[PDB]
């Protein structure tokens, strides 16, 4: 059967929207389109930098962007002229003045998006999937991470029959809502096509 999106069904209950602001019919579409374009542009440019979550906060006629990454020196380089050139680039996507905050995240191997991208980029270099998935599960489980499930689907190896593999550890209760399941998907474009990666990480029970 088809599973509901774990992040979608938890919006409002325990998850939070990445783009938080207010608008009306005059510029709701404009603001939403600007946010999607700016997120696409940021990911496409600094794909090398390990970026996970981009938050958009729009007060009156301004935009405050906070970026979550594991390598802050890549963007804050030699007093961060990268920051200023980034601001100049962003100024045209939305006419309001831009404000950039770089946020550091502890334990990058407990983040679903970073883990998925790491697995995908290992797969792109013709590393067989079992070792990569096992080591990802090992690293995640070694520090907290009361559950993790990793799934990879596609033309594994080079055989001309696609299939699906997945490894789980701990407990990953998806039907419960008190849980905060971090979930991410990514793709790898090898010589035989696209191989998809999905990661679920269960951190704990939200009480209170």
């Amino acid at each position: 059967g088809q599973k509901v999106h774990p992040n979608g069904i938890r919006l409002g209950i325990v998850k939070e929207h990445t783009s938080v602001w207010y608008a009306d019919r005059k510029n709701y579409a404009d603001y939403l389109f600007a946010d999607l374009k700016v997120r696409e542009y940021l990911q496409d440019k600094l794909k090398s930098a390990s970026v996970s979550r981009i938050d958009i906060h729009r007060p009156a006629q301004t935009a405050r962007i906070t970026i979550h990454t594991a390598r802050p020196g890549i963007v804050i380089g030699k007093k961060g002229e990268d920051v200023e050139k980034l601001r100049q680039d962003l100024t045209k996507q939305m006419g309001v003045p831009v404000h950039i905050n770089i946020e550091e995240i502890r334990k990058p191997e407990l983040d679903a998006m970073l883990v998925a991208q790491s697995v995908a980029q290992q797969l792109e270099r013709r590393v067989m999937f079992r070792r990569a998935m096992k080591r990802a599960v090992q690293n995640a489980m070694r520090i907290g991470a009361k559950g993790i499930k990793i799934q990879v689907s596609g033309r594994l190896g080079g055989a001309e029959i696609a299939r699906t593999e997945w490894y789980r550890e701990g407990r990953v209760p998806l039907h419960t809502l008190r849980a905060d399941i971090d979930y991410a998907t990514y793709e790898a474009h090898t010589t035989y096509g696209v191989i998809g990666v999905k990661v679920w990480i269960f951190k704990g029970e939200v009480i209170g």
Partner: protein, 100 residues
């Protein structure tokens, strides 16, 4: 949802937006009863000679991301299905699945 389709509908958008008042003037002339046939026929000819691809009826709004004609929600600028992706990712503000 070809590249050419998006470009050539941007053409309609540009032409319609560029005049944007002469149509209103001519329709005000026509709709006004006390305008006389002398001032109505010249307005008819003006409307006829003006390019056809500058009308609201000639515009078909598509997705701003892919250009899918069908399945459009003008509350957003999105198609039927990219709305679902954006909502699940959490990019659309204030949107949650409803039961009631």
């Amino acid at each position: 949802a070809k590249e050419s389709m998006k470009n050539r509908e941007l053409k309609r958008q540009l032409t319609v937006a560029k005049y944007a008042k002469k149509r209103a003037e001519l329709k005000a002339i026509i709709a006004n009863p006390n305008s006389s046939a002398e001032e109505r026929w010249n307005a008819q000819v003006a409307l006829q000679k003006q390019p056809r691809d500058a009308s609201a009826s000639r515009l078909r709004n598509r997705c701003r991301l892919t250009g899918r004609p069908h399945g459009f929600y003008r509350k957003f600028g999105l198609s039927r299905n990219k709305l679902r992706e954006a909502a699940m990712r959490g990019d659309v503000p204030g949107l949650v699945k409803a039961s009631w």
